[PDB]
């Protein structure tokens, strides 16, 4: 028997198979299931994810909840309620790993780089909970957010490359009057970290509107701009093509960027084309 | 959707085309069966195919591919063995509707990039001199399950390692598929049917007989034990000429890491000449 779903209400669902027979018996009555995968803590960007997400027409609208260990509840749920949401998938760490870390997925050599410079295996940890929610959810569309370039990439790759039978789709940067890119990380800033926070973004738009004179006067606009900010510790700052790899002599790129701040990490990225 | 004859065989070599006939059935009511091989086709295989056959409403999907991932150099892959038109005849006369029979290139555009990570599991037994081998079983075995997105999985006892990481892959992964696990179909004296058999010479198919011997009669044994399966099963394998045994094992039916209670699975795995030949069997202790 198919769990209890009240349509144009929030349906919030903990068991896997919950929402797996749910989401199955939706798309049977000619819903489209879209999904969008969230660690809480909502806040506009993700919110963002979530309308882009309702604008399919026929869409129900499947947001997960789930702090992934191997990468403010009730508010959240409001806020979901309030963008007329019609499931919450909010599973424990049990649920979704009954038998512990097992089976796992392994991301190809971009995992390796940049954020994977610190980071080794966050990004096995994000595929593997990623290919997990789409074959419990099953989703016709799945969104993720621009700001984690680099998730983005390899969500495709791992899309492609398992035959995932799934839309993904990019979402834009969210972002604060001034530029910066939002996160919950944001409020750790300090008045001063938060102005030189914005050297971020700043360096990026510069960057892209330097890259008619080429590559490398982009780059150099980019960390000039960067090079302005005090008490920002650039970690990287990278211009690739689309799909991560080289840069080509000509066309479409991406620049990304990271820096500590303090104890805060802050990531941004934008698209570049050259000349 | 490309042509699909229905009562004939369909053979499709796109992951694009067996995708959209598989969809294309299972909105119709057909429930999609898949049986993943890699050619070389024996009796033991058409048990799946005829388990497959039976699920009511089924339509049979066997796929052929001879998947380059699960060996290592030289050496192996290039010996496997291929006989294409036995393959679809014996699917024919089966009535067999769809062999999926991908390209290297349709399977793996872009070479070895996203893979799966098995368990623990992988590194020992079959995978203990061959640790990347399951990863490349699972690899491919996720892959045809989201390009044909079966209801049901067929897979033989044989290899009754490769079906324990397969369900567990489809638990870790949460994938919408039911495992089947088919028992292993034998020649007349036991010997376990293997498109490696037939590089046996007269000799050493006779010697062969010992692995089904050494198992059968550990189980009968294990009604003294443990101790006794074990010693029944070595030494017919010791009475036997030329067999070189690589391991014999009696762990879980899950063989994870749990103790042996009152169900297991003896397991060996024996060289005659440069042929490896395996075999299981399950085995109950004081009953
Ligand atoms: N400022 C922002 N704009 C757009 N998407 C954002 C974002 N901040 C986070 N996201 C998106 O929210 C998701 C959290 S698991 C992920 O897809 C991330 O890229
Ligand atoms: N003698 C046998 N009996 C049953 N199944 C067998 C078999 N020999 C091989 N198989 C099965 O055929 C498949 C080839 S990829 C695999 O699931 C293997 O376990």
Not at 45 to 55: E, I, M, S, Y
Request: no cysteine; hydrophobic share 50%.
């Amino acid at each position: 028997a198919i769990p209890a779903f009240h349509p144009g209400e929030l349906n919030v669902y903990s068991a896997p198979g919950d929402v797996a027979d749910v989401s199955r018996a939706l798309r049977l009555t000619g819903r489209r299931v879209m999904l969008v995968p969230t660690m809480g803590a909502l806040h506009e960007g993700h919110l963002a994810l979530v309308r882009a997400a309702k604008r399919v027409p026929g869409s129900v609208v499947v947001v997960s909840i789930f702090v992934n260990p191997m990468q403010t509840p009730d508010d959240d749920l409001a806020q979901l309620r309030a963008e007329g949401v019609e499931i919450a998938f909010t599973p424990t760490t049990a649920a979704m790993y009954p038998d512990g870390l097992r089976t796992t997925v392994q991301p190809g050599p971009l995992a390796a780089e940049l954020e994977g410079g610190p980071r080794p295996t966050h990004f096995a940890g994000v595929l593997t909970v990623v290919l997990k929610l789409l074959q419990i959810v099953r989703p016709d569309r799945v969104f993720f957010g621009e700001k984690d370039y680099q998730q983005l990439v390899l969500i495709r790759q791992l899309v492609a490359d398992f035959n995932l039978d799934v839309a993904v789709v990019g979402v834009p940067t969210v972002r604060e009057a001034d530029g910066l890119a939002m996160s919950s990380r944001n409020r750790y800033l300090d008045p001063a970290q938060r102005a030189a926070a914005v050297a971020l973004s700043a360096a990026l738009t510069a960057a892209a509107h330097a890259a008619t004179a080429g590559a490398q006067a982009a780059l150099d606009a980019a960390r000039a701009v960067l090079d302005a900010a005090p008490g920002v510790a650039v970690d990287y700052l990278e211009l690739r093509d689309i799909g991560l790899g080289p840069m080509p002599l000509n066309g479409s790129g991406r620049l990304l960027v990271a820096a500590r701040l303090g104890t805060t990490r802050l990531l941004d990225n934008i698209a570049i084309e050259i000349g």
